[PDB]
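lol forgot to send this yesterday, sorry. struct tokens for the thing we talked abt
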């Protein structure tokens, strides 16, 4: 079965956070550097992992 786990690499998350503040909330453009990862997946990851508690 294998439950849908957050199969994100530390590297991806690193670039994600770096880009988020450097480029901005330009998720559409950030995916240019992080292909495959869709906006919904990125944001889902961003809200669940990074902004787990604000």
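and heres what i got for the seq, position by position
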């Amino acid at each position: 079965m294998e439950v849908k786990k957050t199969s994100w690499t530390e590297e991806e998350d690193r670039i994600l956070y770096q880009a988020h503040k450097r480029l901005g909330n330009r998720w559409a453009e950030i995916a240019k550097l992080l292909p495959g990862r869709t906006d919904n997946a990125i944001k889902n990851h961003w809200n669940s992992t990074m902004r787990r508690k604000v």
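Residues 1-54 form a domain with the Arc Repressor Mutant, subunit A fold (CATH 1.10.10.60). anyway ping me if u want another try
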